[PDB]
Design a protein around this nucleic acid. Structure first.
Ligand SMILES: [Mg+2]
Ligand SMILES: [Mg+2]
Ligand SMILES: [Mg+2]
Ligand SMILES: [Mg+2]
Ligand SMILES: [Mg+2]
Ligand SMILES: [Mg+2]
Ligand SMILES: [Mg+2]
Ligand SMILES: [Mg+2]
Ligand SMILES: [Mg+2]
Ligand SMILES: [Mg+2]
Ligand SMILES: [Mg+2]
Ligand SMILES: [Mg+2]
Ligand SMILES: [Mg+2]
Ligand SMILES: [Mg+2]
Ligand SMILES: [Mg+2]
Ligand SMILES: [Mg+2]
Ligand SMILES: [Mg+2]
Ligand SMILES: [Mg+2]
Ligand SMILES: [Mg+2]
Lengths: 95, 240, 243, 137, 95, 45
RNA sequence: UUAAUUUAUUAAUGCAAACACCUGCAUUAAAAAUUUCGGUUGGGGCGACCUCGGAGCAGAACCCAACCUCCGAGCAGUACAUGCUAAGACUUCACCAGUCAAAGCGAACCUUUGAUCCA
RNA sequence: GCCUGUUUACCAAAAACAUCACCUCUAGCAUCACCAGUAUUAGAGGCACCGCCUUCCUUAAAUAGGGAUGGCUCCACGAGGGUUCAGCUG
RNA sequence: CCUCCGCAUAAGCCUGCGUCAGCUGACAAUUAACAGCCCAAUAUCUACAAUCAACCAACAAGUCUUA
RNA sequence: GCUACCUAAGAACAGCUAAAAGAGCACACCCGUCUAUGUAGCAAAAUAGUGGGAAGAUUUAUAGGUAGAGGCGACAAACCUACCGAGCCUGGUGAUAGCUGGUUGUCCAAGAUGAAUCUUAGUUCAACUUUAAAUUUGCCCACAGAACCCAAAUCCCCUU
RNA sequence: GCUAAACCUAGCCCCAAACCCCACCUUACUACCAAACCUUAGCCAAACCAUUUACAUAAAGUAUAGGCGAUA
């Protein structure tokens, strides 16, 4: 996402009132483009054996691309939600 | 603008088609190409550039009889009405094509080189190296697009693997799969160059009109100029 | 002269009149209430007060949202509140230089999403922000059911929300027929979002769509006065016979 | 990309015809190795300061020679007065020596027929010019 | 300056004046001498001493500044340890 | 030489300034709306 | 247009971003866009001048022009109290700016260039 | 100026513009112009058909007229611009 | 005595030298055969100018539906 | 609906000479060379004569298209509804104008010739000017006084 | 004595209050055939112009912004 910031500070509007914008308040500077941020990883709980990652029920940090294109769409993995973690915890302790 | 292209016919036919002139205008109605307008009313004869087009419920090499060789208003090359089986179609006539001649259209890449007789269409793989060709396809079955103007002749320069190197009339080499078809010989109306227009009226008949303001950019035509570098600014135009 | 009411209140007045008045109360409240969308294209201030370095005094700070333009194509996709920034910049980022019109557009992707509640795969034009929001929500269905209208900002998204909510409210057996255990599992997973069907019917409907729905609901071919007068005459005759 | 940008420099920023570009890349492919900017400077040196036109540049393979050698010989001739930059009209008081006589020939004939000076003088001038370039940078 | 602002209808202050001049309540304006921080290395000690001084303004200069500032800047200010507290009033002034 | 720029033809008149052409575009609809607001007897030509 | 300022927009490339297409960011171009045309002097030219100072015009308080008649300067040398403070004055006809200075304190025992903002 | 044509509607019709001819540059290709075309093609610019080589006369008096890639060659044409014999004429 | 005039059609205009009584008002009037307003579809068809169309002459290559 | 160009489908071009012609002469038709008239005109570009083309790159009716920094242009800066080096209308708009013009009862009073400035058609400061106020010297002014270098007068002020 | 002169209500202005048969998108006013959303700019002020300016009360023209200047 493109994140921008006004060059010109907007005067305070008040509590219930809405800020009044003028020609100069439409001038922006790009503070950041999120697409250029370093890639982070997705936490997933595997459901089936997958090469070089894990077997089943093990929390894994996978590249978001892989997680969203192969694992999750194919059901090989599930989101590491608290519910999924709990369910796989009962699965583990029931073995 | 309410411009709908006249090229709306969907089914191939022999009958000349009434073609609407463009005047060099887009569908928007603005001039896109200058110097176009007027000229003799013309009718379009749909040319079948896919020489190897086996008839319906038919296949394999087939022959065709040259019903006639006709002048085409829409081309430099003259065309030939040629009939085979139970169909007729317009093709581009080669230099020595005559009415009553027989033309062979084949898709067979024989192990040996087929005797190249002017007018017949064979896959480029079947031709001897160095044969004059025209109506060349870029891809197998695409249809002839190159070497189509009057008197033009490419040369089958080389054949290696499934690829043939052709010399287009612009003396540029082109790589085409040897399965793509081409017709032997040079295109008809070889004397098209020597024609002398003689008078401005003849060009106006041919639909070319004198047109100015052909650039529409600010200042009109502007030849490219070499922008000097800072060191050379001192000597760009030395006063005498 | 002067209008009795401010011109900016005319829409609310109209909502209080006619078919828009007969519209269900919950839908009218949903239209009336307006919440600011989550910051997407600007970094919100951490707190309501700040020590400005110039004079070292505690000054109030407000978050003024950047106007976002959403092209109509966005209504057919799921942009996680992301849109076009139609603004201006200073060439070379110095205010003493030229001021230039600048449009920032999101990077749009085509992705396929599977909805558990709908048991359907949708191909949706999407943004990386939307993908991240889906990941944080732990699934497309969770993202749709959690994200409010303002943050979702997609007619397609709101239609998906209405479909999922109606599916939950009806407990529709059409969700994986011949697999009642799986259907119950899905409904239990998304139980927390269930609402009455009378309300799920009006989720995400534009004002015009709601008006059309209400008109269709309350359209009735007039009863012939023959029936009304016969009922009245029979009732009166019954009263006379009793008396 | 390197080949494409070299050709684009030769065509757009140097106004060499397509045939001229093929001739250049055929006679002396070292142009491709030579980095942009330096090539543009060499061409503009031929065009503006030396007054050479594209046909003559291509005919003499001026781009083949090194910029240091080109400057060493041309500046020597210019300061000697045996070479004059063509004026705005493209004319000169005295016809200039030909590029084959300037660059193609060896130092001996170059100083004996075109410059008519002494080898020691040329060495001194070369060292002086090297210092001038160093200072200019 | 702005005699009637577009939002309040009030008279505005020229803040360039406030950034440069001190008003003593009695009606005097104090200022720094121009160039008092410029190229001191080439100025004689007497010139530097003259330049480092706080200087009063003319009657017409004072009238101009009074016009260019609003009545807020022309009030009594009882600052804690104002160095100019004593100078804010005139004494033994005959006409 | 000049002055007779108007060469009347009902076909051109209606095709150029008629009700249908006015309604054909939002700009023309606003032309009609302005005429209506002004109270013109003749909204279109 | 080799005037100044831009590249928003397109075209190229490059780098990220999504795994041909597209988004962001840079660079180079194309195309353009916005804006300006200092002053005094000089008819037969191919410019000169614009600030400060000295002399005459202007003889004797001050002041006095010019396309007027002449000359000079954009600092250096010195030292490093060539420091700090402060009565009272002068003043280039305004302001800005620029000068001189007793007393006092402190060491010792000097003879021209330009503001504000901004950094 | 090759020519027929075009042009400043309303002060210029021309030697200007176009023009066949020629040269240069750019383009190897299809489903809205170019083009339902394809290098003998298309777009742009330049140039100009074409072809060949590299003091005297006029008057009586004449600031008029005619003659002793480049250099030439004017076939025809012209409400073009000059000069002239003869005639004709307010 | 005069006229590239006149009569029609097209286009345009819209009652704008018909009657009556006082330019205004009232009253009347242009009658379809001419002209306009068309076609039930699906597909399949439709190379071969015109120029007195026959020779002759070409190039600019030229309105062409049955089941 | 003019005009420029273009699209669709139409139409016109006598006679003679010549033969398939951007051919000759010359009607219709188109144009507008030259002259005169007209110049608030018959006409916001005409009339009369004269003249150019007149089977073509022709002329022309009908309908459609291209739209304003745009179109169109056989480039004349030509044309785009009589005034196109960039249409017209509405709006911004009561644009702006250091420039021109105008600025309406009676009566009295005081009232006149440097600096900076993209500045010399303007403005700001000064000087002058007006009003009101405070209190106390103001002008004139003799004697004394104001430079060496190398005239008329002026400055200064006791008295008056 | 001609032309003329005159006239007073037709209405309007600013507030307050109150929220106000048939035909017709085809060539409109013709009875009847197989598709919207998207920064205003610029004049103007800055004595040019280029960033900029220019679409209850009180706090206060204050904090702030600003070729730190016009001004906001
Ligand atoms: Mg007409
Ligand atoms: Mg003074
Ligand atoms: Mg000519
Ligand atoms: Mg004219
Ligand atoms: Mg004309
Ligand atoms: Mg004329
Ligand atoms: Mg004569
Ligand atoms: Mg002619
Ligand atoms: Mg004839
Ligand atoms: Mg002729
Ligand atoms: Mg023309
Ligand atoms: Mg011209
Ligand atoms: Mg001109
Ligand atoms: Mg006009
Ligand atoms: Mg005004
Ligand atoms: Mg008086
Ligand atoms: Mg200045
Ligand atoms: Mg002025
Ligand atoms: Mg201004």
């Amino acid at each position: 996402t493109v994140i921008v910031e006004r060059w010109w500070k907007v005067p305070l509007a008040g509590e219930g009132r809405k800020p009044r914008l003028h020609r100069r308040h439409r001038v922006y500077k790009l503070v950041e483009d999120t697409k250029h941020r370093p890639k982070e990883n997705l936490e997933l709980i595997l459901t089936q054996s997958v090469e070089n990652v894990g077997v089943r029920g093990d929390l894994v940090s996978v590249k978001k691309s892989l997680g969203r294109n192969r694992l999750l769409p194919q059901g090989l993995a599930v989101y590491a939600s608290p519910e999924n973690k709990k369910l796989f915890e009962e699965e583990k302790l029931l073995r | 603008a309410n411009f709908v292209s006249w090229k709306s016919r969907t089914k191939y036919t022999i009958t000349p088609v009434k073609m609407r002139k463009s005047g060099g205008r887009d569908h928007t109605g603005r001039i896109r190409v200058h110097g176009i307008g007027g000229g003799h009313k013309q009718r379009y004869r749909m040319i079948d550039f896919l020489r190897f087009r086996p008839e319906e419920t038919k296949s394999g090499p087939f022959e065709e009889k040259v019903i006639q060789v006709r002048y085409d208003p829409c081309r430099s090359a003259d065309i030939a009405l040629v009939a085979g089986g139970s169909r007729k179609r317009w093709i581009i006539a080669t230099e020595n094509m005559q009415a009553g001649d027989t033309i062979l259209n084949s898709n067979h890449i024989g192990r040996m080189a087929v005797a190249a007789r002017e007018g017949d269409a064979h896959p480029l793989g079947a031709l001897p190296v160095g044969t004059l060709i025209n109506n060349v396809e870029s891809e197998p079955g695409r249809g002839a697009q190159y070497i189509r103007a009057a008197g033009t002749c490419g040369v089958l320069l080389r054949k290696v693997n499934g690829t043939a190197i052709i010399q287009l009339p612009s003396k540029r080499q082109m790589q085409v799969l040897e399965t793509c078809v081409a017709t032997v010989g040079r295109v008809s109306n070889v004397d098209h160059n020597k024609r002398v227009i003689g008078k401005a009226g003849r060009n106006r008949w041919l639909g070319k009109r004198p047109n100015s303001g052909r650039w529409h950019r600010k200042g009109g035509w502007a030849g490219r100029k070499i922008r000097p570098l800072p060191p050379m600014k001192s000597y760009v135009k030395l006063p005498s | 002269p002067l209008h009795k009411y401010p011109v900016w209140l005319w829409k609310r007045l109209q909502l209080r009149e006619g078919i828009c008045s007969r519209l269900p109360g919950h839908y009218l409240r949903s239209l009336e209430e307006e919440r600011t969308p989550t910051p997407v294209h600007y970094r919100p201030h951490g707190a309501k007060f700040k020590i400005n370095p110039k004079n070292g005094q505690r000054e109030r700070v407000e978050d003024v949202p950047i106007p976002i333009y959403f092209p109509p194509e966005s209504q057919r996709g799921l942009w996680g509140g992301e849109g076009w920034i139609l603004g201006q910049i200073y060439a070379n980022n110095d205010k003493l230089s030229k001021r230039l019109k600048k449009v920032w557009k999101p990077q749009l992707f085509e992705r396929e999403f599977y909805s558990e509640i709908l048991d359907k795969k949708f191909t949706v034009t999407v943004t990386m922000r939307t993908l991240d929001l889906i990941d944080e929500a732990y699934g497309l269905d969770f993202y749709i059911l959690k994200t409010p209208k303002e943050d979702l900002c997609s007619k397609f998204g709101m239609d998906l929300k209405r479909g999922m909510l109606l599916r939950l409210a009806r407990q529709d057996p059409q969700l994986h027929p011949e697999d009642p255990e799986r259907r119950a599992a899905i409904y239990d997973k998304y139980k927390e979002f269930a609402i009455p069907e009378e309300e799920a019917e009006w989720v995400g409907l534009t004002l015009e769509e709601a008006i059309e729905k209400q008109r269709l609901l309350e359209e009735k071919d007039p009863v012939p006065l023959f029936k009304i007068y016969v009922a009245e005459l029979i009732q009166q005759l019954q009263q006379q016979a009793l008396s | 990309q390197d080949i494409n940008d070299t050709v684009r420099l030769l065509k757009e920023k140097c106004l060499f015809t397509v045939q001229q570009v093929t001739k250049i890349l055929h006679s002396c492919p070292s142009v491709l190795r030579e980095d942009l900017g330096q090539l543009e400077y060499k061409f503009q040196y031929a065009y503006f300061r030396m007054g050479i036109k594209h046909p003559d540049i291509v005919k003499s393979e001026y781009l083949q020679y090194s910029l240091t050698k080109i400057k060493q010989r041309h500046i020597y001739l210019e300061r000697l007065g045996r070479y004059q930059t063509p004026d705005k009209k493209g004319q000169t008081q005295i016809p200039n020596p030909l590029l084959k006589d300037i660059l193609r020939v060896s130092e001996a004939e170059f100083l004996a027929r075109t410059a008519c000076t002494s080898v020691e003088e040329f060495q001194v001038f070369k060292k002086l010019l090297a210092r001038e370039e160093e200072e200019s940078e | 300056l702005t005699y009637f602002s577009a939002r309040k209808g009030k008279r505005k202050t020229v803040k360039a004046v406030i950034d440069r001049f001190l008003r003593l309540h009695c009606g005097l304006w104090v200022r720094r001498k121009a160039g008092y921080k410029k190229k001191l290395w080439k100025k004689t000690p007497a010139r530097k001493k003259r330049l480092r001084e706080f200087v009063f303004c003319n009657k017409t200069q004072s009238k101009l500044l009074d016009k260019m500032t609003t009545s807020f800047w022309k009030r009594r200010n009882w600052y804690v340890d104002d160095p100019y507290q004593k100078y804010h009033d005139r004494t033994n002034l005959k006409v | 030489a000049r002055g007779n720029e108007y060469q009347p033809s009902n076909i051109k008149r209606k095709n150029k300034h008629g009700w249908v052409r006015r309604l054909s575009t939002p700009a023309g609809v606003q032309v009609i709306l302005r005429r209506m607001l002004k109270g013109r007897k003749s909204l279109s030509h």
